[PDB]
Amino acid sequence: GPHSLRYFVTAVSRPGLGEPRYMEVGYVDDTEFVRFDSDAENPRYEPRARWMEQEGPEYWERETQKAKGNEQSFRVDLRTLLGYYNQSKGGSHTIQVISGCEVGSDGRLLRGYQQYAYDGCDYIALNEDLKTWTAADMAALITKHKWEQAGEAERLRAYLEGTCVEWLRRYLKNGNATLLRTDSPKAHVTHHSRPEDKVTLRCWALGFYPADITLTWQLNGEELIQDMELVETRPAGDGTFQKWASVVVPLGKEQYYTCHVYHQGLPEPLTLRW
């Protein structure tokens, strides 16, 4: 299938409470595998999956040093942005970045990302052509004009077509046996009587992975497209995820309803019935 390597960067200023807090978090196929955080004992790049411990001391030493440079650099961006927007120098502000690539099955680049946000909102992004930028307002245009003059798009294109996909291939070789791990859900229906003369059927799916799940309730072969309570898929806090969908039914009529669970772990989708 496709694969991705993406880094989610955060710098948040704490006026008076010291230097801004800085962090980099790395994802392979949307699973955290490295993390840097300025607010640890000795801020280090850390492995976040057992299979990243196959890297030797050189790797962590390079990425830790690189992160300290990016940190110092984002401390300046925060001061720069406050000036561009001509804001008060007292409040806390945030910069976020999404940076990385998606590659098809041949291992070649499908999409590259270079997304900045200031204070939760789009600031500048690298377009899909990997040559031009989209600025979100006039402050971001100063950055655009500067980055056009620096050849920043060319520098990013080289990174995303070369360095980035090469590291992703490196990471895939070590992690593939773990990242393709699939855990099928564990389903059961619960029953909760309510006033008056109707009852809440709640269909549970537990311990599944990946979090990609679909749950439906049905009356005699029709998807009760609402209303029917759904819960945002949630981590159980151990690598697996949870989710439930509930529907309200008349008293005595429970057996006419069926719950359906769709997940890549299941050969056949689950049908459950109170």
């Binding site: 960067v9 992160a67 650099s73 961006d77 970045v97 900045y116 600031y123 500048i124 520098r155 360095t163």
Partner: peptide, 8 residues
Amino acid sequence: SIIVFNLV
């Protein structure tokens, strides 16, 4: 490996 970033 994350890229080294430039200044906005």
